[PDB]
């Protein structure tokens with residue numbers, strides 16, 4: 790990708806614009822994402838601990854005696870989340886479930902006050918991986934990600950850089966991860982059937998092949 794191509798991807802849930810920019814803004818809480826490449830050359834992706842759908846559902850409750858859920862969202866939730874919703878009612882079965890669902894996200898987080906971009910990336914990578922990810926080298930390319938969530942009608946902005954890390958894929962793939970932010974770190978190329986695979990793959994390719 791050249792300095793001024795903008796590419797717009799669409800999935801059943803998201804529209805996302807990816808555009809190469811020169812500098813990251815820094816205001817209140819800028820969001821910075823790490824596209825991590827392992828020592829053995831694998832692109833990494835996180836499975837968010839809480840799905841976007843279950844986060845939203847929880848935020849929509851307003852009564853101790855009423856629980857409300859759009860059934861369209863059931864296919865975008867984890868097993869434990871579905872169990873929590875239906876734990877008291879316990880009907881025979883439920884419909885529209887995807888047992889393969891995972892909420893794929895680039896690792897990363899919010900920029901602190903007067904925190905450098907690279908320090909933010911190092912710190913968030915450490916927090917989200919239980920101290921198991923360190924950065925050998927940062928890439929040059931900076932992408933701005935603009936995402937519209939089609940289900941909730943919200944727009945999000947973040948910025949992404951490449952992080953070539955010291956760890957191998959296997960280094961991050963024996964021990965389960967205990968974060969409140971992340972339930973798994975895995976190879977993006979183990980996720981070919983995910984709604985997000987095409988645009989995440991594009992991000993990695995643009996960051997390393999430009």
Ligand SMILES: C[n+]1cn([C@@H]2O[C@H](COP(=O)(O)OP(=O)(O)O)[C@@H](O)[C@H]2O)c2nc(N)[nH]c(=O)c21
Pocket residue numbers: 802803820841842844845936937938941945946947
């Ligand atoms: C709640 N939420 C967060 N994101 C993404 O996650 C990034 C950070 O999300 P955040 O809302 O800024 O902080 P949070 O993780 O504590 O919620 C955003 O820049 C978005 O990329 C989300 N992305 C989509 N498509 N839908 C969502 O509901 C959503």
Ligand code: NA
Pocket residue numbers: 818819820821946947948
């Ligand atoms: Na941001």
Ligand code: NA
Pocket residue numbers: 879880881
């Ligand atoms: Na049952």
Ligand code: NA
Pocket residue numbers: 860882883884885
């Ligand atoms: Na149902």
Ligand code: NA
Pocket residue numbers: 868886887888
């Ligand atoms: Na299920």
Ligand code: NA
Pocket residue numbers: 865890891983984
């Ligand atoms: Na999905």
Ligand code: NA
Pocket residue numbers: 894895936
């Ligand atoms: Na994304």
Ligand code: NA
Pocket residue numbers: 920921922923924955956
């Ligand atoms: Na590390």
Ligand code: NA
Pocket residue numbers: 921955956960
């Ligand atoms: Na290591």
Ligand code: NA
Pocket residue numbers: 800802983984985
């Ligand atoms: Na998806």
